[PDB]
Ligand binder design. Structure first.
Ligand SMILES: [Ca+2]
Ligand SMILES: [Ca+2]
Lengths: 182, 126
């Protein structure tokens, strides 16, 4: 299984086994069941098991490939493989796209961008007017929406990111190479 | 010349929800405070004000391009805080000031940020 996992991901056997040590920590913090549930995930990211956040919900949801409400070790390793420095960049691009498509519409809707921008402000404890938020949403959206049709599609997103590669900066954990030593 | 442009998609990458570095922490005893604010004042003026307050608080400051590096001059280790501050234009008259800890103790950092903001309450926007 560590050998099977290592063969479907950029990780080696020794790396998968190192990640298992981490998973054991993350998955045992509230209910020790070899699974990570929403509250255990909020605890690992925020050090507050009760802190709700749109982006963490989106990450959690994408990690949960089995759509069963939890992250098993297999789900955990397969998804983290995408954050490896050596994962193909197009996988990184499509993972971010999936995160931002809040309600699985197949596009990044304009109101989905807006909801994200509001959540970011809320998260940061910043207070801005509706008009100001609109200017911010509009500038980004008109630029990504190449074809001028009112939605953002995968190919438009791919081109947008090719023009600003730092948009997927979060999509690399540049020390998934140094996990053995950790 | 001005601060780097940060469009809405760039801004959202700031979220603690999207950055999974925290899962790899070994020791974390404390909860992250939000250390960011927005302002409408001219960027060069934001910088000068941040430099002035920091100097009076016992920090050595070095600015390159709307990015400032602050180092504590205290002779006592807990006070040897390192901090980086960058300004980004998020909208034509709206600038975000993002404050980050480069080194030092979290609780000392939080104390610092609180004190900084109380000295700068004028430049901070609603
Ligand atoms: Ca669990
Ligand atoms: Ca489009």
């Amino acid at each position: 299984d560590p050998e099977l996992l290592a063969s479907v991901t950029p990780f080696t056997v020794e790396e998968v086994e190192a990640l298992y040590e981490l998973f054991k920590k993350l998955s045992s913090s509230i209910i020790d069941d070899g699974l990570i549930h929403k509250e255990e995930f909020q605890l690992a990211l925020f050090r507050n098991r009760n802190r709700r956040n749109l982006f963490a919900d989106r990450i959690f949801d994408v990690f949960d490939v089995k759509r069963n409400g939890v992250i098993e070790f297999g789900e955990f390793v397969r998804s983290l493989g995408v954050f490896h420095p050596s994962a193909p960049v197009h996988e990184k691009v499509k993972f971010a796209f999936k995160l931002y498509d809040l309600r699985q519409t197949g596009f990044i809707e304009r109101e989905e961008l807006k909801e994200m921008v509001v959540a970011l402000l809320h998260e940061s404890e910043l207070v801005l007017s509706e008009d100001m938020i609109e200017v911010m949403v509009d500038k980004a959206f008109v630029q990504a929406d190449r074809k001028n049709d009112g939605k953002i599609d995968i190919d438009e997103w791919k081109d947008f990111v090719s023009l600003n590669p730092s948009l997927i900066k979060n999509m690399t954990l540049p020390y998934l190479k140094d996990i053995n030593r950790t | 010349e001005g601060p780097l442009m940060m469009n809405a998609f760039e801004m959202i990458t700031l979220s603690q929800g999207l950055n999974l570095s925290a899962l790899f922490d070994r020791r974390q005893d404390f909860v992250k405070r939000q250390t960011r604010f927005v302002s409408r004042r001219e960027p060069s003026e934001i910088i000068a004000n941040i430099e002035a307050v920091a100097n009076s608080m016992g920090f050595k400051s070095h600015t390159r391009n709307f990015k400032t590096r602050l180092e504590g001059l205290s002779s006592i280790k807990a006070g040897q805080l390192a901090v980086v501050i960058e300004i980004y234009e998020v909208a034509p008259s709206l600038f975000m000031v993002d404050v980050r800890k480069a080194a030092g103790e979290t609780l000392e950092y939080h104390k610092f940020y609180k004190k900084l903001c109380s000295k700068l309450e004028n430049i901070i926007w609603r």
